Amino acid sequence: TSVKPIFSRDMNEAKRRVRELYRAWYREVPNTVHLFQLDISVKQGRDKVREMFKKNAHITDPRVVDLLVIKGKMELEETIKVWKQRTHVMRFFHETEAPRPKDFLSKFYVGHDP
Amino acid sequence: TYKYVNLREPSMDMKSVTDRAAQTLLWTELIRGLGMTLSYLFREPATINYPFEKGPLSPRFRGEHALRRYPSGEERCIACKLCEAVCPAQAITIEAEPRADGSRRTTRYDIDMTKCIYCGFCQEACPVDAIVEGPNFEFSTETHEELLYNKEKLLNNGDKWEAEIAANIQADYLYR
């Protein structure tokens, strides 16, 4: 189990890079809303950022964490430099997707998907 | 072997230097360029009077698709699905079953003309010359749905265009 690292020697160093990324995203949301003229609030933007970090909270491999951070920085740079358009920033909120209830009976009525 | 495109030293004699000064001051090479566009003004233009005149084409031209018949009126297609298999775009859809007289014939033959790349592979693959690309190229539509051809459309195309298609096949089948 001797593997070449990416950036972090262990989870302690990786969680430091995670916190650094979270700060960068957290500071950036106010500019993103302003620059892209989004009709959402800074609170919704930061709640969405928080929701994106939370879904990955269960990782324990430092290499996987490093790659998630690398992608997070790539995503942040795309946003800061306005390489993304408003459509890309808003794809995180899936505003046109209809609710898909997640209880057995609701799925049973609509189709065969488990 | 190679040649140099731009490797020449201008002559430094008095006549040459004064020739270049005249070119610089009197714009001789720019005047020469004006002569070329002037000569074109007095040439007959290359434009043709479409739609009263048409650009030339050959018998091999790949245009709108059609399903053909034998001289008896029977359909040529026997639902082998070679065209459907070879289609690079998967633009062909086929269903078949025994006909009421036991013939092997299609019940579905769709070509999605917005998927099709008009490559002619289907007519190469057909063993009986049932599916062809005809010579028509003026079938633009107002809606997307009008370009999803089913078997009725393709048979009507064959009946509509057979007179030209058969003459075109006659001209080129010895090259195939």
């Binding site: - | 190679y2 090479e29 720019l30 020469r32 360029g33 070329m36 566009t37």
Partner: protein, 51 residues
């Protein structure tokens, strides 16, 4: 060529514009006219010919 080659406006727009050295062209992975414009004597039809 009458319109462009000796035209002083054309030369002003293209002469000494976008100079690439032979060494840079090779390391950057250039090929074709992008190599031969800088003096590299290379053309796959001559050096690695086909049909």
């Amino acid at each position: 060529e009458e319109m462009l080659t000796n035209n002083r406006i054309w030369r002003n727009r293209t002469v000494d514009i976008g100079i690439v050295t032979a060494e840079d062209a090779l390391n950057y992975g250039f090929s074709g006219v992008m190599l031969r414009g800088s003096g590299i004597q290379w053309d796959l039809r001559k050096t690695q010919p086909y049909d």
